[PDB]
Amino acid sequence: NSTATLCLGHHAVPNGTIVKTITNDRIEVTNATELVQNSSIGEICDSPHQILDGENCTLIDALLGDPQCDGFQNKKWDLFVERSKAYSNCYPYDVPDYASLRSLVASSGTLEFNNESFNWTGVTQNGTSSACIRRSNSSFFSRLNWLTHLNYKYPALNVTMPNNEQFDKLYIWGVHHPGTDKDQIFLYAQSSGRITVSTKRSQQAVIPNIGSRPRIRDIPSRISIYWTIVKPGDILLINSTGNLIAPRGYFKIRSGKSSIMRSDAPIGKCKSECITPNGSIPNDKPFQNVNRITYGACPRYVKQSTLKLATGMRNVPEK
Amino acid sequence: NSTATLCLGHHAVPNGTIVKTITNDRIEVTNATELVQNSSIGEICDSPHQILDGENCTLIDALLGDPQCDGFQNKKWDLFVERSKAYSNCYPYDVPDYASLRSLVASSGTLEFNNESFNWTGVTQNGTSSACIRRSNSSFFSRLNWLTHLNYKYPALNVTMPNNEQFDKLYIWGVHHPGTDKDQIFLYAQSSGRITVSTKRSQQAVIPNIGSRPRIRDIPSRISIYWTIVKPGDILLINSTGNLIAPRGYFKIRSGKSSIMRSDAPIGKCKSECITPNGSIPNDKPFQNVNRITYGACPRYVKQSTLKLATGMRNVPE
Amino acid sequence: NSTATLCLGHHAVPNGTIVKTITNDRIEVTNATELVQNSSIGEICDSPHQILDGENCTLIDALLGDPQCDGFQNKKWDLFVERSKAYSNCYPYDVPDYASLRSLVASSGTLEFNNESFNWTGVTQNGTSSACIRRSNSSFFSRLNWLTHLNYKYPALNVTMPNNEQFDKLYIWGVHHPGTDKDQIFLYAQSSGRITVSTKRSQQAVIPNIGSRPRIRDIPSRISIYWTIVKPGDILLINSTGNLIAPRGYFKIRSGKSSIMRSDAPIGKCKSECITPNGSIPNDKPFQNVNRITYGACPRYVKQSTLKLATGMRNVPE
Amino acid sequence: GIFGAIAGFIENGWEGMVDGWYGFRHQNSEGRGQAADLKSTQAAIDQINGKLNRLIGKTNEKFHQIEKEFSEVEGRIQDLEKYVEDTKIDLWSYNAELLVALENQHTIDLTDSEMNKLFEKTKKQLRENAEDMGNGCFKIYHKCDNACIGSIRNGTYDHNVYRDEALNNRFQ
Amino acid sequence: GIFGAIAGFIENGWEGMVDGWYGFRHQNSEGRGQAADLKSTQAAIDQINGKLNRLIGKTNEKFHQIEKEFSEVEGRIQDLEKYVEDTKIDLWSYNAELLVALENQHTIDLTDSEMNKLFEKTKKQLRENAEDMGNGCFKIYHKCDNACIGSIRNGTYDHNVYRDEALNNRFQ
Amino acid sequence: GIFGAIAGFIENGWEGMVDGWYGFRHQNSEGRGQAADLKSTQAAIDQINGKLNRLIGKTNEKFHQIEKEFSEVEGRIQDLEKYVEDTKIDLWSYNAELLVALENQHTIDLTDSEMNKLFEKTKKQLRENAEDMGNGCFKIYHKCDNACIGSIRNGTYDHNVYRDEALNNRF
Ligand SMILES: *[C@@H]1O[C@H](CO)[C@@H](O[C@@H]2O[C@H](CO)[C@@H](O[C@@H]3O[C@H](CO[C@H]4O[C@H](CO)[C@@H](O)[C@H](O)[C@@H]4O)[C@@H](O)[C@H](O[C@H]4O[C@H](CO)[C@@H](O)[C@H](O)[C@@H]4O)[C@@H]3O)[C@H](O)[C@H]2NC(C)=O)[C@H](O)[C@H]1NC(C)=O
Ligand SMILES: *[C@@H]1O[C@H](CO)[C@@H](O[C@@H]2O[C@H](CO)[C@@H](O[C@@H]3O[C@H](CO[C@H]4O[C@H](CO)[C@@H](O)[C@H](O)[C@@H]4O)[C@@H](O)[C@H](O[C@H]4O[C@H](CO)[C@@H](O)[C@H](O)[C@@H]4O)[C@@H]3O)[C@H](O)[C@H]2NC(C)=O)[C@H](O)[C@H]1NC(C)=O
Ligand SMILES: *[C@@H]1O[C@H](CO)[C@@H](O[C@@H]2O[C@H](CO)[C@@H](O[C@@H]3O[C@H](CO)[C@@H](O)[C@H](O[C@H]4O[C@H](CO)[C@@H](O)[C@H](O)[C@@H]4O)[C@@H]3O)[C@H](O)[C@H]2NC(C)=O)[C@H](O)[C@H]1NC(C)=O
Ligand SMILES: *[C@@H]1O[C@H](CO)[C@@H](O[C@@H]2O[C@H](CO)[C@@H](O[C@@H]3O[C@H](CO)[C@@H](O)[C@H](O[C@H]4O[C@H](CO)[C@@H](O)[C@H](O)[C@@H]4O)[C@@H]3O)[C@H](O)[C@H]2NC(C)=O)[C@H](O)[C@H]1NC(C)=O
Ligand SMILES: *[C@@H]1O[C@H](CO)[C@@H](O[C@@H]2O[C@H](CO)[C@@H](O[C@@H]3O[C@H](CO[C@H]4O[C@H](CO)[C@@H](O)[C@H](O)[C@@H]4O)[C@@H](O)[C@H](O)[C@@H]3O)[C@H](O)[C@H]2NC(C)=O)[C@H](O)[C@H]1NC(C)=O
Ligand SMILES: *[C@@H]1O[C@H](CO)[C@@H](O[C@@H]2O[C@H](CO)[C@@H](O[C@@H]3O[C@H](CO[C@H]4O[C@H](CO)[C@@H](O)[C@H](O)[C@@H]4O)[C@@H](O)[C@H](O)[C@@H]3O)[C@H](O)[C@H]2NC(C)=O)[C@H](O)[C@H]1NC(C)=O
Ligand SMILES: *[C@@H]1O[C@H](CO)[C@@H](O[C@@H]2O[C@H](CO)[C@@H](O[C@@H]3O[C@H](CO)[C@@H](O)[C@H](O)[C@@H]3O)[C@H](O)[C@H]2NC(C)=O)[C@H](O)[C@H]1NC(C)=O
Ligand SMILES: *[C@@H]1O[C@H](CO)[C@@H](O[C@@H]2O[C@H](CO)[C@@H](O[C@@H]3O[C@H](CO)[C@@H](O)[C@H](O)[C@@H]3O)[C@H](O)[C@H]2NC(C)=O)[C@H](O)[C@H]1NC(C)=O
Ligand SMILES: *[C@@H]1O[C@H](CO)[C@@H](O)[C@H](O)[C@H]1NC(C)=O
Ligand SMILES: *[C@@H]1O[C@H](CO)[C@@H](O)[C@H](O)[C@H]1NC(C)=O
Ligand SMILES: *[C@@H]1O[C@H](CO)[C@@H](O)[C@H](O)[C@H]1NC(C)=O
Numbered sequence A: 001n002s003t004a005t006l007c008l009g010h011h012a013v014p015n016g017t018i019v020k021t022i023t024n025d026r027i028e029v030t031n032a033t034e035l036v037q038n039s040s041i042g043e044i045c046d047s048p049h050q051i052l053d054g055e056n057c058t059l060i061d062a063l064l065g066d067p068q069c070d071g072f073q074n075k076k077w078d079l080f081v082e083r084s085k086a087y088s089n090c091y092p093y094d095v096p097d098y099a100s101l102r103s104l105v106a107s108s109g110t111l112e113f114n115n116e117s118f119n120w121t122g123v124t125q126n127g128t129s130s131a132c133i134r135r136s137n138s139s140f141f142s143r144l145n146w147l148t149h150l151n152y153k154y155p156a157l158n159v160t161m162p163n164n165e166q167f168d169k170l171y172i173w174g175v176h177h178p179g180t181d182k183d184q185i186f187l188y189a190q191s192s193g194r195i196t197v198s199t200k201r202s203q204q205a206v207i208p209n210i211g212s213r214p215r216i217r218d219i220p221s222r223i224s225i226y227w228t229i230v231k232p233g234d235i236l237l238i239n240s241t242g243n244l245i246a247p248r249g250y251f252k253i254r255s256g257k258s259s260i261m262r263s264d265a266p267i268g269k270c271k272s273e274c275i276t277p278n279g280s281i282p283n284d285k286p287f288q289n290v291n292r293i294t295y296g297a298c299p300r301y302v303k304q305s306t307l308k309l310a311t312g313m314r315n316v317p318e319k
Numbered sequence B, C: 001n002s003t004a005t006l007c008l009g010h011h012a013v014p015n016g017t018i019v020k021t022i023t024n025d026r027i028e029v030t031n032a033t034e035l036v037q038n039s040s041i042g043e044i045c046d047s048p049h050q051i052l053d054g055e056n057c058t059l060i061d062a063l064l065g066d067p068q069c070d071g072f073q074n075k076k077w078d079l080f081v082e083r084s085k086a087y088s089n090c091y092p093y094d095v096p097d098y099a100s101l102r103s104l105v106a107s108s109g110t111l112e113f114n115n116e117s118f119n120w121t122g123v124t125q126n127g128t129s130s131a132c133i134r135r136s137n138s139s140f141f142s143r144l145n146w147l148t149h150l151n152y153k154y155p156a157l158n159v160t161m162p163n164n165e166q167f168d169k170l171y172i173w174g175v176h177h178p179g180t181d182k183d184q185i186f187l188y189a190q191s192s193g194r195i196t197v198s199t200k201r202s203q204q205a206v207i208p209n210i211g212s213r214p215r216i217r218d219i220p221s222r223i224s225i226y227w228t229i230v231k232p233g234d235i236l237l238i239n240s241t242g243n244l245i246a247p248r249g250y251f252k253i254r255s256g257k258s259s260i261m262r263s264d265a266p267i268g269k270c271k272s273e274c275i276t277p278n279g280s281i282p283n284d285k286p287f288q289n290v291n292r293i294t295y296g297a298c299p300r301y302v303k304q305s306t307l308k309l310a311t312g313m314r315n316v317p318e
Numbered sequence D, E: 001g002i003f004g005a006i007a008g009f010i011e012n013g014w015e016g017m018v019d020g021w022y023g024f025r026h027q028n029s030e031g032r033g034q035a036a037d038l039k040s041t042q043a044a045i046d047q048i049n050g051k052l053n054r055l056i057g058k059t060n061e062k063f064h065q066i067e068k069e070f071s072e073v074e075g076r077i078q079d080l081e082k083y084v085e086d087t088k089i090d091l092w093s094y095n096a097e098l099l100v101a102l103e104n105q106h107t108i109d110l111t112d113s114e115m116n117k118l119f120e121k122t123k124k125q126l127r128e129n130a131e132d133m134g135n136g137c138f139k140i141y142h143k144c145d146n147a148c149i150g151s152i153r154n155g156t157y158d159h160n161v162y163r164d165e166a167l168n169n170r171f172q
Numbered sequence F: 001g002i003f004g005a006i007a008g009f010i011e012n013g014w015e016g017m018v019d020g021w022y023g024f025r026h027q028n029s030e031g032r033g034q035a036a037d038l039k040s041t042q043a044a045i046d047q048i049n050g051k052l053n054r055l056i057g058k059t060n061e062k063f064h065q066i067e068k069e070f071s072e073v074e075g076r077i078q079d080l081e082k083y084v085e086d087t088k089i090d091l092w093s094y095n096a097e098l099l100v101a102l103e104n105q106h107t108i109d110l111t112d113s114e115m116n117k118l119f120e121k122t123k124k125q126l127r128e129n130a131e132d133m134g135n136g137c138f139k140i141y142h143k144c145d146n147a148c149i150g151s152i153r154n155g156t157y158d159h160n161v162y163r164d165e166a167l168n169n170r171f
């Protein structure tokens, strides 16, 4: 009369990992995976997204034509990376809605300038300044045109540029605010010069303010930058008497996956579809803790540094 | 025999339905229901929400007085529907913070104009242009008064009007921008002007800008529309040296369920709490995939085309 | 006999609590706890946070130096409380982006004014008004200097103030809009006086509008308040030909746990990590139903009034 | 399937089970038969209905909201409005998927509980007069006609009536 | 009720037990009495306390936020500021509602599970010395003095001592 | 612990069970030994893998979003941008936390289920030939070689051939 015994049981591991459930803060299980990406490789991968590095240039500076940003002319990008070392080496400028312009150009993702010939009759063209030094001579923004008086007479300007090529045009333009009255007569030969740039749907009027300003690159005058968008079938109308920083052409605006990100991480050679200011990160986890700023297919940002999901059963040790 | 058998079992159907679980993406259950709305009627319902159709008119144009929009005077709505075929046939106008005014009038839900009595002494009222063609001859925005020189003079205007009523009043006024200096001299007999609209708590000052602009209806000149809100115990003061397009009174404002929707869908006879630009949809399912724009009692918008909820046990065949 | 009965049972309470499950909307359980706070002591606690009441003084008035607000000078706060019984009697003033500046100073949580000596040569300082009665005598905003003509002439002002301190400076200045042109000539000896305050990264230019406005304390004129932030390593440049309400110094801006809240509730001496406009609430429960505006370690507001969590088993009584 | 009833010992479902969701299929000397248990069926149906009512019929009212579509590019304000709506849709989309997945898993498991509850009720009813083969069936070691099978289904089974015959047929 | 113990075969709860959540009620030759199982009670209480310690006491600090009450109707910015807060409130309210419903469901299930675990533990402890009546009670087919019930409740019951007597009372 | 098997009556984990998650450890004539059940183990991995597949799935692809870091202090519009991002971050962090807690609890219970299921299947197989002590072990009252253990492990076990021997041994 023999007997036998048959026990049923599960496996166990020496130490295991600790997770959290609905009922307990700490519980030991055999295996668990991490759901939060807590690290970055340290560099921004140049694939699969197109990366343009501004280095010493900002997006607006490359848009305007800073003498250190002529290499960004007619350049497209998927993500524009701005460094915390960029500076301006041109005429001091102030864009009243800077963030909106930067977002506009970033979402456009292209800096594509097609030049147009405006009938600037009676005004001296291609103005120059000692703050903007292209090559080794005084210059100005490449995409900007500075008009001064001809024969000490600045005539009225009435220039029309329609849009018939079936794509929206982004026009840059500016208004010069001289630091002295004497400067205003020296360049524009008028007391004060009004500016009116209009389309069939929008109008913009700018009046210049003449007065001293803090000197950057030994220039007390400033220039205000404005942007105008013209639809296909609409005409751009510029009507002025002076203090006009004229467009040299039209910038193209597109609708795409493009944006701009601020970082100081090197553009290393790899492929990662998620870019972060701290560097590119891998999209193998649902969540992440690197940065709240993301581009591409990116894990969602959470405040928690650690979040483990058990890939095994409760670990009951033999001991 | 001395033996019986009694088996316990469950039901099964050939019309299975695959649903989603935590641990499985494809599991077959007996019965299931749909949680997301995928199709619309396609047309907006007149019930229960009051629907006003602008057809060829926008909310701002009706608020301003474009002649084709003159039928919307004194009208109210629970939801204003703006069509793609909308167009303007009055003076070329521009409203800074246009979206703010549009939302403000929409949340108001009323276009109630009661005319007031400004003195406007020394100027000619009821200006007209060859674009705002009401009746058959020339007119202007029915809600706006255009002031020009009387006896070739434009005396300075300083008018007052108190808010002695317990409802906040909304005033629409404007500034005229002539295309030429010769124009500005012709209309107002003066070289440019100023306008200042003031309350005991807010002040707005506008400057006319003379310059050539793209001609709409052969009019190179423009007018800029602004709004002022005057509350009870306050006074509206208008101080103009010229180029003022004056209000003709006050619009009443309200707070309520009213809004505005942009749609090109027809208007039908039905009752539906949910109104969308694509059309009215039933609100029985908890979610929807028609449009992120909804009005009234509506299911919430989700990005997934279907969300099937199981109403039965797992379906195993025989 | 050789028979025994051993029953296994559970505990039941005479009167349980009804809770809600995903399956049953109403099921009875033994013990339950509330997860939503719907009550308050009706008081604001000055612990652990630093609470500063405003009484008759708004945050902007204390920043500017309203005579009744002089007790708020050089004071700090974690939370600033604004009461509906707030009145200003210095001078009628309008702040472009009033809300932004209010958030500016609130987030700073400090009003630390350090005085500086600008040139102000050729102009008369310490201008006074009869609406700003400080100490039974006409005065002005404490932190703002009113600049008048001297010897019936107003020289052009061009004043530079550098920031070498290792922190940021906040400047509050103003522009005067006289009600009549005779007032403008009487004060500033010039028909029109421009203002331009500029840094190396900003430029603010203002041209005043002369015009009568609704009178508060018999003052038909208005001063428009502007603020300029000068970062460490920048300069503040003031360029004027008249109509200047200049700063008497700089305000120190800081970052921290500071903010502002509106509440007509008393501040007794208690301790609560959570503050709401209805009065400090406890933070034991994870949710609250008192107000959406919260400050500190606060439960999260929800639409629901009461949510019950089962702290016991299902109740079946005998 | 946490008890292993629908996909466990009971390997197959019955399509002829059209009078209910859970049922009894007996074979005896009087032939076969198939009957329905309505307590288990309703104890399920009410549970999923209670879910359905928690989900279906609850609706919010949103009258005036932000603009969600745009025609001209503006800048920071338009991008902020787009971002707020995008984050709202995605968060509710997650809530919908997690709702469906959690409730469907519960639906399967609650039907698992009901089937196992029926098996336990029958097994405790039969006491020592029957044995389970692990396929959802019970071997009744005493002759049971249609009447006493209905006594099983109706709850009126006196195990003492047939205890001796079943025990003799089980151990001898 | 996924195990069918609280609302099932044990269809009556005892208000007389005040020293524990689960317990025993015995009838023997010495009379009748009641006791409580502190271990299973403690396990259920600990699980509930773990739920509370995950919920109660967790506070989030927010100091400076957007304005949520506006006195003058501004328009676009005011509408947007209203919309974000309304969206946040709605999403958090749904999170709260789903939380309490799920937690109450799991609480009921866990209490049912603890009761079922005690029943199966007693069943496996009694082995073939007793049988299940299907109402939560066990019929012991041998003489149990009060120390016998104590041995079942303390964990020191030896079935091999009463096995022969119980088998004779069972199958004879 | 809901079924009370992993932390319940089987309150011991075998670190020597490196082949599978659950299984059988036997002692009979011809000696003691240890083996694994492959169906129950695979069922547990399949459920966990289904959880993992549903977790990452498709990752949200966002390209141009609002600004989230600011150098200068601007006021209302910047506070609005910060508040929007805070609210989104906190809501997603809460979703993260609840998902981790609930799924981890579900994993604990699914593993306890598969154990109790395997135990129930083995009981139903042994019929009246064996008895349960209450520790995941069965006392078999018929001589079982290292062969009929495999029969129990693989479904090819007939209780009718050991029925009389086990009954006589039991009573
Ligand atoms: C807001 O509202 C106020 C109040 O109406 C306006 O202020 C008026 O401004 C005008 C023009 O600047 C002033 O008109 C001038 O009046 C002078 C005489 O005024 C006296 O007589 C009148 C009665 O006729 C009294 O009401 C007044 O109080 C004085 O006692 C004239 O001599 C001036 O003439 C000059 O201009 C005309 C017009 O081209 C020329 O023909 C003349 O040759 C000369 O150049 C002038 O007409 C008026 O007095 C002011 N009223 C006041 C101060 O109460 C604001 O202009 C208005 N807008 C703004 C932006 O503030
Ligand atoms: C453009 O048009 C507007 C119309 O709204 C004019 O604004 C009004 O201007 C008049 C004055 O011209 C204002 O009327 C005066 O109001 C004073 C208010 O004073 C307050 O404070 C004092 C104490 O400081 C209190 O005593 C008083 O009760 C008030 O609380 C009154 O004091 C004035 O009365 C005195 O003067 C008049 C005139 O001499 C005498 O008849 C009286 O008896 C008394 O001595 C006077 O009533 C009026 O309030 C203004 N309205 C608004 C809404 O502001 C602009 O002036 C005008 N602009 C021009 C023409 O350029
Ligand atoms: C900001 O600060 C700057 C610097 O102080 C200041 O620029 C100055 O502007 C004034 C006004 O335009 C200039 O002063 C004038 O200069 C001319 C030329 O020298 C003189 O003819 C003027 O004479 C006045 O007085 C005469 C006698 O009554 C009158 O007949 C004549 O019409 C004038 O009224 C007067 O002195 C000054 O030269 C400049 N400073 C420079 C160029 O360095 C500016 O005005 C300030 N404000 C603003 C808003 O910019
Ligand atoms: C937008 O552009 C328009 C022009 O298209 C401009 O409006 C004015 O247009 C006229 C012609 O259409 C410009 O020409 C003037 O014509 C008159 C004759 O009527 C001349 O007298 C003017 O100056 C001459 O004479 C002066 C005195 O002898 C001299 O000082 C001068 O050098 C000339 O010899 C002039 O030729 C006119 O100039 C413009 N207006 C102005 C202010 O220039 C309109 O102004 C433009 N937009 C804006 C916002 O100003
Ligand atoms: C209003 O007041 C302002 C007070 O600052 C005036 O601005 C100053 O104007 C003077 C001329 O009168 C300038 O002086 C020249 O500056 C250049 C620049 O070099 C200096 O700055 C660079 C900056 O990097 C620094 O590296 C150098 O070491 C110098 O310190 C000098 O090269 C010249 O020699 C000369 O000093 C001031 O630079 C200028 N300062 C500012 C901050 O603008 C303004 O002109 C007045 N407006 C009027 C009177 O209308
Ligand atoms: C904490 O303090 C808060 C502010 O004092 C309290 O808020 C109050 O809450 C009560 C109860 O919900 C509200 O009473 C109802 O309000 C609704 C809304 O109507 C208002 O809005 C519509 C918008 O279209 C407008 O048309 C109406 O005229 C109203 O202005 C009414 O329909 C009801 O009849 C009823 O009045 C208060 O309105 C509300 N006060 C506010 C928002 O100022 C809050 O209850 C306090 N919490 C506590 C004490 O626990
Ligand atoms: C400044 O440049 C603009 C653009 O070239 C000029 O606008 C054009 O002005 C002429 C009249 O001088 C307009 O012709 C008129 O058109 C109307 C409508 O078709 C027609 O009914 C009249 O009989 C006349 O032919 C022309 O349409 C207009 N073009 C545009 C695009 O607006 C403007 O005249 C120039 N000068 C000034 C002072 O603005
Ligand atoms: C313009 O008005 C300001 C503000 O009232 C004047 O500054 C103030 O000047 C007084 C003295 O006239 C200062 O009070 C005294 O300060 C000294 C030194 O600390 C102390 O020993 C005395 O006991 C008394 O407290 C007062 O602090 C000062 N306020 C400031 C600087 O904010 C200014 O003098 C006036 N200028 C002119 C030209 O009238
Ligand atoms: C200014 O530069 C452009 C560049 O193409 C040229 O076309 C134009 O003739 C120049 N104008 C001058 C030199 O006056
Ligand atoms: C990423 O960088 C930000 C600052 O740009 C920092 O606050 C954050 O802690 C970093 N996250 C890391 C290193 O994971
Ligand atoms: C609206 O305009 C269309 C032309 O676009 C016209 O056919 C229709 O009759 C108009 N409806 C009105 C004016 O009610």
Ligand SMILES: *[C@@H]1O[C@H](CO)[C@@H](O)[C@H](O)[C@H]1NC(C)=O
Residues within 6 Å of the ligand: B119, B121
């Ligand atoms: C203003 O209008 C009122 C209307 O009754 C009139 O009595 C008064 O004389 C008017 N004032 C002027 C200055 O025309």
Ligand SMILES: *[C@@H]1O[C@H](CO)[C@@H](O)[C@H](O)[C@H]1NC(C)=O
Residues within 6 Å of the ligand: B125, B126
């Ligand atoms: C201007 O139109 C209004 C409209 O009600 C009318 O009362 C007034 O008499 C008109 N003025 C004229 C025609 O001069």
Ligand SMILES: *[C@@H]1O[C@H](CO)[C@@H](O)[C@H](O)[C@H]1NC(C)=O
Residues within 6 Å of the ligand: C030, C031, C032, C311
């Ligand atoms: C229910 O639980 C709470 C937890 O704080 C406790 O204070 C209360 O006494 C309990 N009620 C009962 C009846 O056990």
Ligand SMILES: *[C@@H]1O[C@H](CO)[C@@H](O)[C@H](O)[C@H]1NC(C)=O
Residues within 6 Å of the ligand: C055, C056, C068
């Ligand atoms: C506020 O004003 C009231 C009168 O309106 C006065 O009684 C009270 O003392 C004032 N409080 C302060 C702090 O000035």
Ligand SMILES: *[C@@H]1O[C@H](CO)[C@@H](O)[C@H](O)[C@H]1NC(C)=O
Residues within 6 Å of the ligand: C119, C121, C122, C156, C157, C158
């Ligand atoms: C500023 O003050 C200095 C010193 O008193 C003086 O020399 C200079 O002229 C002043 N600047 C002016 C008056 O613009």
Ligand SMILES: *[C@@H]1O[C@H](CO)[C@@H](O)[C@H](O)[C@H]1NC(C)=O
Residues within 6 Å of the ligand: C136, C137, C138
């Ligand atoms: C303050 O006001 C009183 C009013 O009675 C006046 O007499 C006194 O002169 C004023 N103070 C000074 C310093 O003048």
Ligand SMILES: *[C@@H]1O[C@H](CO)[C@@H](O)[C@H](O)[C@H]1NC(C)=O
Residues within 6 Å of the ligand: D150, D151, D154, D156
């Ligand atoms: C058993 O119950 C059924 C209803 O479920 C009834 O039709 C039948 O007559 C009953 N039979 C007995 C024997 O109780």
Ligand SMILES: *[C@@H]1O[C@H](CO)[C@@H](O)[C@H](O)[C@H]1NC(C)=O
Residues within 6 Å of the ligand: E147, E150, E151, E154, E155, E156
């Ligand atoms: C078992 O019950 C008996 C009752 O006589 C008691 O003496 C003993 O202490 C109990 N066991 C334990 C471990 O307490």
